[PDB]
């Protein structure tokens, strides 16, 4: 979609805030909600892709100046309402309880070693998105190609900064699951991936370091040839 | 920056604490949570993975120009032999500083970084200011906001990560290390200094 | 600049808040806000680009979610200041005057009958931008041009969704004042000012509208010729 | 919408409300502002100039063809003649919707309006919600903000007024009005028949 998210080539958004040193996790409802990752993920709440497009979701202004891991509840909750298994008036009678009594027990519950091995599983061996396909590569390192200029309002990876630029393809990564329909709810439908460049001045104009290039990675549907 | 919209911080913590603990007590009950689990994945990312695996490949490229090569022909490959992998580096593309190139990396689009390496990113490669700027400006905010001069005339490659393929820099050695063991170049090798946002340490 | 206030074609920014009736003033803070334009503006503050420039500087989460006036406010301190018409500390320090003591009554001043008719003059006969210049005009209605892919850093009209696009001119203006110079603090150096018409296949890629156009303004600079 | 980050309404006031009278204090005393000049721009616009004014202009072309081409060759000078134009509205471009086109003016990069026959914009004109999603999906936009259904087969045209021309909606005279005086073919022009968001009133 085009929201606030994709700010590559944004201006006025202020100088970078870089403490000389910051923990991990700032405050143990951070831990909370990135452990809810593998957690929603596991129950079927949403995918990689879908994950992303819930936060791209996100009121543009809670999420410009929000901790980073209230973006990840946000996605959460979308995703929890989206496939019923997230009750609103039920969360938010919640929320004022804890509100008033914040130091209240959690639920009671047993512990799961399976949760526990699937967390260790998929830290350790990942969770790979290529993918095989029976379509060879439609394209080449050299191939002089041109980015769509196509908007979709669901989720893609489809910055505005690159739409309709020219770019010279470096290389080709295999096939991977496709933002564009898994992202939407569509399944992994999977394209071939490659890598592009884009020079400054064709990104920017003539204010572009004459000197400078941005790599970027898009999907077969998202270049068309230009030059072989 | 100021916004006069924005309660304090303090009242904004308070909020999301409430919600986070509320939303938590419902996926408990359902099963699908745990306070083991919670804890699991902290551990990992607060004491397990980190910045200290790269630096392990970087040191290793740096004295075994043979390991060098598998690293940039195969990055998720090359570092599976150190037993270094894993969820969100599953394809993994080192790339190389050299006189003539440096290399920055950015995800404009979200957050997207290459944890079994460099373990979960700091705040800042996350925020909107850092990412919004790289693509555009890269020479600039290099010296501004690190120190870091580019000289006019080597390219910048600005590698904005919008697939799960990661980047990772492979930044040049230092002089003044020739014959260093590989614990002691480690201590040169910087999270900064793989994401292409500084060079590793002097001296 | 390319800043969040430039928001053609974004998505996700919320529906349409549109009260069944609201009065022109909601509060006497916008009465002063909104009679704070002439007055900063006769005293040299600013001109019209250079006020749109002040606001385009601002917070971005602020600017999506102020009151509109406040911008105006934002503006207008952010002009006093790079003129040093406004000192900042005695300017906090009266804020937090006026905070605890909300109903103090305001300096002692004497009223000018100058300031009225400047007012009257202003709002019945205008502030006219058209100028004359020596230049005939470049571009006539029927060609193709392509818009500007520059990206300048200070104050211009080149809205990001229009960049780089191609385009038929439909009109020619005249000359008028540069908001590239003019907003910069740079002077008038007037060009001439043409609408160009865009059509949404053009602008939003398979998703627009087959049936629909936007017309869009430009300055000579922006536009070069594709075919006439 | 919801943003947890944001104070009540009612602090956000009080915080503008001393940070304009500490403003207003100093630009009094620099002698730029006065009681009596606020008091006038106020009563200028909220009595004085208003949409009351494009409906004259309307109801004359409407049942004057000559007045209306001069309005569509040059609309200044066509406004002038009915003694209405200044400010912000120096330029001022009217354009005809027929049974073939349909327009419809916004101002995505800030909030540009033709101040002498519409007077202040609304704040729906002003806000991004309006002006973000006008010039990408107008069609759809009538329809679910206005109720405005565009047949799919007739064209809009979305103009965005990026300079000082200040653009301005001609709309078709209702069916059933045939030989109405132009006070009474007023009663039908809207502040929304002119920005192109609606017809002029049915009946």
């Given at each position: 979609?085009?929201?606030?998210?994709?700010?590559?080539?944004?201006?006025?958004?202020?100088?970078?805030?870089?403490?000389?040193?910051?923990?991990?996790?700032?405050?143990?409802?951070?831990?909370?909600?990135?452990?809810?990752?593998?957690?929603?993920?596991?129950?079927?709440?949403?995918?990689?892709?879908?994950?992303?497009?819930?936060?791209?979701?996100?009121?543009?202004?809670?999420?410009?100046?929000?901790?980073?891991?209230?973006?990840?509840?946000?996605?959460?909750?979308?995703?929890?309402?989206?496939?019923?298994?997230?009750?609103?008036?039920?969360?938010?009678?919640?929320?004022?309880?804890?509100?008033?009594?914040?130091?209240?027990?959690?639920?009671?519950?047993?512990?799961?070693?399976?949760?526990?091995?699937?967390?260790?599983?998929?830290?350790?061996?990942?969770?790979?998105?290529?993918?095989?396909?029976?379509?060879?590569?439609?394209?080449?390192?050299?191939?002089?190609?041109?980015?769509?200029?196509?908007?979709?309002?669901?989720?893609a990876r489809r910055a505005r900064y690159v739409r309709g630029k020219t770019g010279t393809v470096v290389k080709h990564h295999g096939a991977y699951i496709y933002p564009d329909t898994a992202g939407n709810g569509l399944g992994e439908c999977p394209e071939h991936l490659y890598t592009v460049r884009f020079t400054a001045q064709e990104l920017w104009g003539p204010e572009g370091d004459p000197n400078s290039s941005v790599y970027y990675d898009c999907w077969e549907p998202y270049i068309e040839l230009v030059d072989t | 920056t100021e916004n006069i919209l924005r309660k304090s911080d303090e009242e904004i913590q308070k909020e999301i604490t409430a919600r986070v603990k509320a939303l938590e007590s419902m996926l408990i009950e359902q099963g699908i949570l745990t306070t083991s689990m919670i804890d699991r994945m902290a551990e990992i990312y607060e004491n397990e993975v980190g910045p200290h695996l790269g630096a392990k490949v970087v040191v290793k490229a740096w004295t075994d120009p043979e390991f060098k090569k598998r690293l940039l022909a195969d990055g998720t490959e090359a570092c599976k032999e150190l037993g270094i992998g894993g969820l969100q580096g599953e394809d993994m593309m080192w790339v190389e500083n050299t006189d003539e190139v440096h290399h920055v990396v950015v995800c404009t689009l979200c957050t997207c970084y290459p944890w079994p390496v460099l373990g979960l990113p700091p705040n800042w490669f996350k925020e909107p200011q850092y990412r919004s700027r790289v693509v555009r400006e890269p020479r600039q905010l290099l010296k501004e906001e690190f120190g870091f001069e580019v000289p006019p005339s080597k390219e910048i490659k600005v590698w904005d990560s919008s697939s799960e393929m990661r980047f990772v820099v492979l930044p040049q050695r230092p002089a003044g290390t020739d014959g260093w063991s590989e614990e002691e170049l480690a201590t040169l090798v910087t999270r900064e200094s793989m994401i292409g946002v500084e060079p590793a340490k002097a001296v």
């Open positions: 979609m085009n929201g606030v998210y994709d700010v590559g080539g944004t201006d006025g958004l202020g100088p970078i805030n870089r403490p000389a040193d910051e923990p991990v996790f700032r405050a143990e409802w951070e831990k909370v909600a990135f452990a809810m990752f593998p957690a929603t993920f596991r129950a079927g709440f949403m995918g990689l892709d879908e994950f992303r497009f819930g936060i791209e979701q996100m009121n543009p202004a809670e999420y410009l100046e929000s901790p980073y891991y209230w973006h990840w509840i946000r996605t959460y909750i979308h995703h929890g309402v989206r496939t019923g298994k997230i009750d609103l008036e039920e969360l938010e009678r919640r929320t004022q309880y804890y509100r008033e009594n914040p130091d209240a027990p959690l639920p009671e519950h047993e512990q799961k070693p399976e949760l526990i091995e699937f967390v260790n599983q998929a830290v350790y061996g990942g969770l790979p998105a290529s993918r095989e396909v029976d379509r060879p590569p439609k394209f080449k390192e050299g191939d002089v190609v041109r980015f769509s200029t196509a908007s979709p309002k669901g989720h | -």
